């Protein structure tokens, strides 16, 4: 430790607010590079430099005050570009070994400190001025390299994640990412991103600008971002008072129910009762030791602890939570997003698609391209501008491209067991983008223009005639798994299914019959494929969280369930004890008034069950087990 801490001091010293470099500072930073060139795989030199806080202590003063020496400026920039490179790229993965895990965490800690240190607007200002000078040349390879490393420096600074677990800030407060983003605006560096994105000859930089822009907007979804306006202050104030009111009210109500359930006399007042005629697990009647009031809602299991699960038996879970940034940041982001869509989207997408098609040996990350089209199409649609603003993406090639990518991800998720989690994440991203394409063609039907309506019919015609889009949903439902994907994937999949069936039904109405890739089609025959009992199990799992599901989610799932049960007459497939337990809890909750469709559907299907049970007593056995299609149909025959 002491060796580096002693030698690194050579760069200079600070006098009040004036920084004085040493006369061999350049040779000194060259020695720091020589240290890094012979660093250990644990990244020990980087941890030592971080402990010595060289970047915060000397490099920021050198860049702010001594940048007139362009060779020294170049040396400092490249040094900190190597130092700031994200930990996942340095180690190659999050390490399995505890020693390397500790080193990774420590390196990432120093990177977090560097990100906080970089928040000074003066650095971005100098960087933007330098970059503004470089682009005026219409240059040497070293000039291009300086542009490259400037872009990569801000990329690396943005890339290292914020520790929301450390910050624990309330909504509308600024995180480290938020403050740094605001500093980008305050420096004017954003204007250069829009120049680079809009200028045609800068296509080589546009691929980097895509990563920069997509890194900035991560915390804000485009729909709520499009929602913002100057009156939001009073809106949030009044709404928060209302939210606090209902929260307090709910706790009061629940308390009183518990208070009435408990007896009034103290916990040692005693007593004992025999439930005459109710036999035990043993040969004789049950003896009950608890208070008299408890028998009003008795179930024998109330005394039991839950079953202890094995470690490897646990399902997947979310590592993320919804947020909103400070109103200043929200307004700035909305302006930037509007200006990017206005000036840059189609040109940048054409450039990025060109690079992804041409430059396959370079292994560029396609997920950013899909993220950007998924984000900006949603923003454009939320603002309901003319479809011309997103013209480039409105073509069949996008559907085929994302289908082959999504099916590749699906096949890899199945085959490449060692990376199935990441393949599932990639597949989920692709599904999200595809849902936006469907929403876009649906929206232009309700436009006033016949030309775009005809274009919509052309796209939808190809999508429904070809096999892949109508087969894909069944392929995903067939291989959904609790370890493989969290429930968010299932929500997206079933909602996309409802939208696909809606547009399919509307398209089938155009002619006496639809012919498809070759066979005469039948909508009811296609829906019969979803009568697989595994699909119903997934639907029931999604239904357990109906109070936490969105209103749109609940509408979509209940609509599809009623259609499948009623019109296909497959009703007996829903006669299940797990479902009946959920129905019992549903009808017991006093909040049932909010869920009229669900309770009426539940009472309807239970009516069918009790009507059958009155005739046939075997239903009480069938209720324990899942049905094959033949059994579902045979139960009505008896």
């Amino acid at each position: 430790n002491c060796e580096l801490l002693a030698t690194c001091s050579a760069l200079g010293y600070l006098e009040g607010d004036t920084y004085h470099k040493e006369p061999d500072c350049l040779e000194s930073v060259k020695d720091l590079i020589r240290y890094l060139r012979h660093e250990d795989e644990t990244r020990d030199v980087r941890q030592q430099l971080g402990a010595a806080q060289i970047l915060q202590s000397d490099l920021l003063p050198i860049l702010t005050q001594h940048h007139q020496d362009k060779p020294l400026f170049d040396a400092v920039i490249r040094l900190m570009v190597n130092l700031t490179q994200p930990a996942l790229l340095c180690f190659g993965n999050l390490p399995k070994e505890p020693s390397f895990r500790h080193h990774f965490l420590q390196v990432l800690t120093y990177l977090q400190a560097y990100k906080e240190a970089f928040a000074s607007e003066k650095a971005f200002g100098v960087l933007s001025e330098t970059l503004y000078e470089l682009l005026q040349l219409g240059r040497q390879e070293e000039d291009n390299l300086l542009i490259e490393r400037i872009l990569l420096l801000v990329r690396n600074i943005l890339h290292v994640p914020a520790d929301l677990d450390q910050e624990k800030k309330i909504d509308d407060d600024a995180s480290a990412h938020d403050q740094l983003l605001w500093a980008i605006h305050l420096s004017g560096l954003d204007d250069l991103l829009l120049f680079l994105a809009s200028s045609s000859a800068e296509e080589q930089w546009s691929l980097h600008v895509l990563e920069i822009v997509s890194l900035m907007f991560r915390d804000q979804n485009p729909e709520q971002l499009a929602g913002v306006g100057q009156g939001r202050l009073a809106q949030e104030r009044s709404a928060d008072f209302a939210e606090l009111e209902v929260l307090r009210q709910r706790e009061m109500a629940e308390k009183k129910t518990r208070a009435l359930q408990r007896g009034n006399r103290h916990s040692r007042f005693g007593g004992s009762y025999i439930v005459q005629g109710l036999k035990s697990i043993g040969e004789r009647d049950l003896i009950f030791h608890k208070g008299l009031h408890n028998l009003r809602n008795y179930s024998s299991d109330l005394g039991k602890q839950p079953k202890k699960v094995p470690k490897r038996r646990q399902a997947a879970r979310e590592l993320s939570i919804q947020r909103r940034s400070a109103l200043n940041v929200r307004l700035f982001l909305r302006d930037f997003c509007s200006e990017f869509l206005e000036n840059c989207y189609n040109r940048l997408m054409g450039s990025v698609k060109d690079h992804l098609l041409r430059e396959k040996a370079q292994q560029h990350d396609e997920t950013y391209y899909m993220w950007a089209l998924a984000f900006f199409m949603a923003f454009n649609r939320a603002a309901s501008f003319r479809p011309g603003l997103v013209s480039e993406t409105l073509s069949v090639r996008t559907f085929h491209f994302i289908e082959q990518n999504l099916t590749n991800y699906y096949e890899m998720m199945l085959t490449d067991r060692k990376e199935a989690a990441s393949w599932a994440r990639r597949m989920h991203l692709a599904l999200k983008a595809y849902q936006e394409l469907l929403a876009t063609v649906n929206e232009m039907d309700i436009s006033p223009d016949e030309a775009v309506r005809e274009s919509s019919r052309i796209i939808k015609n190809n999508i429904f005639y070809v096999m892949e889009y109508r087969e894909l949903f069944l392929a995903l439902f067939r291989k959904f798994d609790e370890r493989c994907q969290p429930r968010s994937f299932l929500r997206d999949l079933v909602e996309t299914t409802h939208l696909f069936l809606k547009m399919l039904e509307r398209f089938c109405r155009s002619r006496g019959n639809l012919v498809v890739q070759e066979k005469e089609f039948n909508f009811l025959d296609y829906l019969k494929r979803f009568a697989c009992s595994t699909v119903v199990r997934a639907y029931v799992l999604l239904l357990r969280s109906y109070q936490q599901n969105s209103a749109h989610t609940n509408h979509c799932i209940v609509k599809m369930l009623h259609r499948l049960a009623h019109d296909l007459k497959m009703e007996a497939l829903l006669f299940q004890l797990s479902v009946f337990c959920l129905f019992n809890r549903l009808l017991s909750d006093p909040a049932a008034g909010a869920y009229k469709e669900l309770v009426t559907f539940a009472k309807y299907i239970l009516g069918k069950f009790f009507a059958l049970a009155a005739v046939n007593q075997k239903a009480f056995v069938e209720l324990l087990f899942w049905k094959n299609t033949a059994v579902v149909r045979e139960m009505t025959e008896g």
Binding site: S199, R457, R511, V515, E520
Partner: peptide, 20 residues
């Protein structure tokens, strides 16, 4: 078969000085 299939098949600048 043939007629529906046939008819359904047949359907198918600014400088950097300006910004900054």
């Amino acid at each position: 078969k043939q007629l529906h299939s046939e008819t359904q098949r047949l359907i198918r600048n600014k400088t950097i000085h300006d910004f900054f």
